[PDB]
Amino acid sequence: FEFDNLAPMLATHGTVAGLKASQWAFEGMWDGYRLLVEADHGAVRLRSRSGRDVTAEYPQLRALAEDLADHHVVLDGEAVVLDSSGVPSFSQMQNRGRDTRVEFWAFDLLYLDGRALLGTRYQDRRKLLETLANATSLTVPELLPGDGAQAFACSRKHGWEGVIAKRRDSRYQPGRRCASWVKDKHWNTQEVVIGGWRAGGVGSLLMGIPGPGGLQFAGRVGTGLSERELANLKEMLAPLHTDESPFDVPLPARDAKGITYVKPALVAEVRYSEWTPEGRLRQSSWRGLRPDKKPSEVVRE
Ligand SMILES: Nc1ncnc2c1ncn2[C@@H]1O[C@H](COP(=O)(O)OP(=O)(O)OP(=O)(O)O)[C@@H](O)[C@H]1O
């Protein structure tokens, strides 16, 4: 076992309603950044999903192990920023500033005080993690009770993004996406390319799907407004400003009012209920930017 070779295990997109509690545990899906956390001698070290050393990017998490000073542990979990409803928000994480509070929500334990746990079944790793957290300041969200449909319904009532089901008998497989973990969201989600923006900072974004002849306008998506989402989103949009509309049809007057067009370089993810027959996203909401996705990969899902 070696923390410096570790990469997170990944979940397969699927449906959790139908899965039974006898074989499956159910966790809330937390929007944030995935972190592997090594705590030793009261000091913390961090690895991102890409294996990069990101310890310096999270000074908020330095105190994580000050309560664990006698332990040597490796944890898996999510760094999160909570919205005003208490729910992890990806956009608030992406737009965090120097005063923004960041938490680490742990959901796995991969090494504990001389015992490497990759081959230990999830159900047993969880009990060890819960015991560790009950005695310290580590934050370990509880499992959702019931079978998959009940767990999904509970997640929805809380306003959480979805559920991750994890097989109770499953080992931890670093760096692999596995059938033993199933991820399921309440909302349909669609990748879109940003073609322009309107002020309230940045009040809203004009979305499109790449096609022959340019972006096919998919509607305006409100940002929700952090008044820092906007200063930061403006920052990412500023190098892309252009006088040339990227859309395949010049935008209608109401959608073009006050618009700054951008080169169609940035992918974002939005939630939606259904497509309209004209190609617009109904009940859209902003999840956040997807900086590693390429516009050429964006297709109507
Ligand atoms: N409780 C949890 N246990 C494990 N992973 C979680 C949990 N909560 C959130 N995640 C992570 O959040 C993401 C939720 O799935 P989603 O489809 O939004 O991911 P993504 O970033 O689009 O794709 P990927 O699965 O490649 O990360 C996954 O990365 C998942 O591993």
Last residue of a domain, one of 185, 218, 242: 185
Give the CB-side neighbour count of residue 291, counting CA atoms within 13 A: 8
Task: Verify that 108 and 166 share a domain, yes or no.
Answer: yes
**Residues 244, 158 share a domain:** no
152, 33: one domain: yes
Q: Specify the number of domains making up the chain.
A: 2
HEC string for 99-145: CCCCEEEEEEEEEECCEECCCCCHHHHHHHHHHHHHCCCCECCCCCC
The two tokens of residue 269 are: 């993810």
In this structure, are 207 and 141 located in the same domain?
no
133 & 20 share domain: yes
Integer Rg of the chain from CA:
21
Smallest CA separation from ligand 1 atom 18, residue = 31
Measured from the CB, is residue 164 less than 6 Å from ligand 1?
A: yes
The CATH number linked to 288 is 2.40.50.140
Q: Are 245 and 195 in contact (CB under 8 A)?
A: yes
Residue having the nearest C-alpha atom to atom 27 of ligand 1: 10
What are the distances in angstroms from CA 226 to CA 198, 200, 230, 287?
15, 11, 7, 13
CB neighbour list of residue 175: distance below 8 Å, 6 or more residues apart? 6, 7, 8, 9
Tell me, using a 6 A CB cutoff, whether residue 220 lines ligand 1. no
The rounded Å distance from CA 205 to ligand 1 centre is 25
Nearest CA to ligand 1 atom 2: 29
Q: How many residues does the chain have?
A: 301
Q: Among 185, 214, 235, give the residue marking a domain's end.
A: 185
CA dist 144 and 148 (Å) reads 9
What's the domain range around 127? 1-185
Question: Do residues 161 and 18 share a domain?
Answer: yes
C-alpha–C-alpha distance, residues 219 and 262, integer Å: 15
Is there a single domain that holds both residue 125 and residue 4? yes
Residue nearest to ligand 1 atom 26, measured at CA: 10
Helix (H/G/I), strand (E/B), else coil: 194:
strand
Q: Is 124 in the same domain as 203?
A: no
Is residue 5 domain-shared with residue 140, that is, in the same domain?
Answer: yes
* Residue 78 CB less than 6 A away from ligand 1: yes
- C-alpha 164 to ligand 1 mean position (Å): 8
Ligand 1 site, residue 191, Cβ cutoff 6 A: no
d(CA 271, CA 126): 31
Resolution in Å, one decimal place: 1.4
Q: Residues 9, 59: one domain? A: yes
Instruction: Quote the DSSP letter at residue 155.
Output: H
261 CB burial (10 A radius; 0-12, 13-18, 19+): buried
Q: Which two tokens stand for residue 122?
A: 């999830």
Same domain for 141 and 204: no
Tokens 């005003």: give the residue: 84
Question: What are the backbone angles phi and psi of residue 90, rounded to the nearest 5°?
Answer: -65, -45
Q: Do 155 and 142 share a structural domain?
A: yes
Q: Which of 158, 185, 212 is the last residue of a domain?
A: 185
**280 CA to middle of ligand 1, Å?**
26
